[PDB]
Design a protein around this ligand. Structure first.
Ligand SMILES: O=C1NC(=O)c2c(NCc3cccc(O)c3)cccc21
Ligand SMILES: [K+]
Ligand SMILES: [K+]
Lengths: 155, 155, 155, 156, 156, 155, 156
């Protein structure tokens, strides 16, 4: 079904953000596992898988709309060197992702692509839940101390 | 069955205290959840539900006694800004609640409303168990230290 | 995540409406139970619980957006003195609630808070279902007569 | 297998009646549900589904006989505005439906289309059962009073 | 709860489209079954049932909004006479249906009927999924050839 | 119970038709199996068994009516030499069979043998279902092509 | 445990090949699904997941050896426009992948990193199974014809 060209551009931009996040979260996950922080590693793995699910839906929507999904261009991964930096890198990425999602929703609404808007709203809800998680973890580090925070994520 | 007017007044006073506690505990619960202190959030949620159960029994008793349950007047919520303060606000509210319960029981006994006395005694038992819990949490903050106390209430 | 100040104001207004409804429906429920109209009492209890669930989600959203949920200011309960009046009082409350929900949604859309919009839309769907129920009951009182209507809600 | 042209016309006429009944009963059902008369709404929903089943068999038969099932021409829905009227509208429709079924059976017998006759007889049995239900409901309104009758149909 | 008059008109227009689709898909289904293409017949039957579900929700919404659901006016059925034509007729109908859904959503948003908007959005998602299916089937006829495509739809 | 002589003659004629069909379908079934077209062989076997069931009921009815069932006179089998011819031969046989069934029913109705009429009507319904199947298969040969049609009946 | 720097370079090169394959196979899967060729889509999805598992093991090994896994540099995806081209693009990628795996194993053996060699051997066994599958599919297109090949991959 022939889609709006600018909608497809917006969907590919969001897909590009999700592809960064997949790799960034997967690497952070395996770094935490290598350090013995297996609870952080598992949670970050599941964040990576969630982003994959969003990417899948975007790819499927772009193909339905007769566009070409762009899996070739990969933007800059924000990789931290320690736990606090890795969480902050994830948060910085998510805040850019939600800005782009809002701009895409505006355009979908203007051209009456209400199904694409709904898909993007569902993705936005997931990303705001991730922001909540990340803000909460950074706050916990300040409240319980870094050593305790890391201890709680060993097992 | 026509109840004693001053009994009904006392029952409405206790109901008023329970309505404050329902809202105070519910908000404290959701603050703790928002901060990632989910064990505190869950326990405080169940404290809110317990107060709802007491309020239900008071409302039923007042209606049986042909009085009007007052759910309109909401007194001052004591909301803390950190875990230590939230627990102490709950304790301050519970100590006022038990004072009012004792005065209500005195009057029930004087006018031979032994069933209302028994209901208030059961509520007083629950409130003293809550005081025990709160005093114990504040003691644990001292004995294990704040960072450990908060850490223990993350999961 | 810092929310829009007016969005948070609107969410607190909707929360205030839900807090009125919780208490109004809970009292109406216990009045109906006291009168032996147990089917009305049970259904109205479940309406109270449904409003509690909405209030919970609003409180959680407000806190995530770094606002202060207002559980202190309780507006006017609309309490009836007989079944038709109680049903009409619930309906009057719901009609005010849905007007406020629509105004809140308009503002969320304007400032691109699409997740808050979605939460409010879900609440609005529940409130219109409650309006449907209430209008239906008032219609049934006319169709089957008040005595039969009450009879059908004894058990 | 090429059927008799007039048999196919009769089958399409009965199909036409069933298509009216499907919509009329479905709308009546949802009206009753909207008023809180859920027992009437559920029963009328099942009457709509039963008509759908008859329509299905007529469509299948017409196609087997190499005719064209007519789902385009929808006749007049008899929509009532209160319970007694809605039941009476259903009854009025069914009485027309059974007259048409009888005339179609006559013609099937004359041209020896005994399988089409048997299908129409089965549908006629269902429609007479519906007439029994409807006459009974109208009678009950008279016997128990309208308010009680509606009361008894609030809950499933 | 009295709805906006133009919202109710839009809802009745979408209902009208769904009523066409119910009959068109049901007839196509039984045509395919009669030809021995039972997999197409079953899938098209389920498309007819899906449209019935949407019609039901629109009828319920219109009644809640104190309007009159229009089940009397049935527009033009697009009946094909071979598999490719039947799929194309379904697609042509769906494309008209989604245009009307979009215009109705616009108006619901303007008058703040956000619940009606959400219902129409859900229906639009289902109809775009149907367009996906239909475009895919037409594409497969081109890729695998018509004879193979039909062969693959003989058996369930 | 003494039956009408012409009714019994008609029932024996229909029985004769069924006996032809039993053998014709059984042979066609085993030809298709020998050629590796097992789905056609199985379906045609079940057509043979269905005709056996009809023959059984006719024999039982004839005997009840105190006639002599004729299993001796076997009419001409219509055996094809390839799949399309075999299907067409079955259809030609079925078209003769249904003509004879209609004539038999006319006579049963005239002499008020309504039970024999009902048995013949049931047999006629089965035979028209078989006609539907056969016409459909011949149509499928045209729609999917002979090679594909045969391929679909291998397994 | 400090690994050999050239081993880590080789592991990152193989990881880079796996990252290309994950995306190429995922896109090819979703293209085949969009075309209704669901059996090809499903199989290609599972090929993508298999490459993800290999990438995970490589990342884990690189981190254990105190290297930095490179998930940033993504080489050229080879995307086909039709089924035959997509299969050949996958095959071309796999042949490059196995050449790089063999060179990595040579170097692991030279510096006595026998555990890294064993990991790469396991990945190579999987990649040669993928090559077997791809060569077989291309051969089946020649043996049964493209239309039949595609037909056989419509349904899972
Ligand atoms: O909080 C409240 N508890 C009540 O009972 C109440 C009200 N009662 C109205 C009423 C009066 C007399 C008999 C009745 O059956 C009901 C009105 C506003 C607020 C409240
Ligand atoms: K009664
Ligand atoms: K083939």
């Amino acid at each position: 079904m022939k889609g709006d060209k600018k909608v497809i551009q917006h969907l590919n931009k969001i897909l590009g953000n999700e592809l960064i996040a997949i790799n960034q979260y997967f690497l952070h996950s395996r770094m935490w596992n290598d350090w013995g922080l297996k609870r952080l590693g598992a949670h970050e793995y599941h964040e990576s898988i969630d982003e994959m699910k969003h990417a899948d839906k975007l790819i499927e929507r772009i193909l339905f709309l007769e566009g070409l999904p762009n899996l070739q261009d990969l933007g800059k991964l924000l990789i931290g060197e320690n736990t606090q930096e890795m969480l902050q890198c994830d948060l910085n990425l998510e805040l850019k992702a939600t800005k782009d999602l809002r701009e895409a929703i505006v355009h979908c609404e203007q051209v009456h692509d209400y199904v694409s808007r709904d898909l993007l709203k569902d993705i936005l809800e997931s990303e705001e839940e991730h922001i909540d998680y990340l803000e909460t973890q950074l706050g916990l580090i300040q409240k319980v101390g870094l050593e305790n925070y890391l201890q709680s994520h060993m097992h």
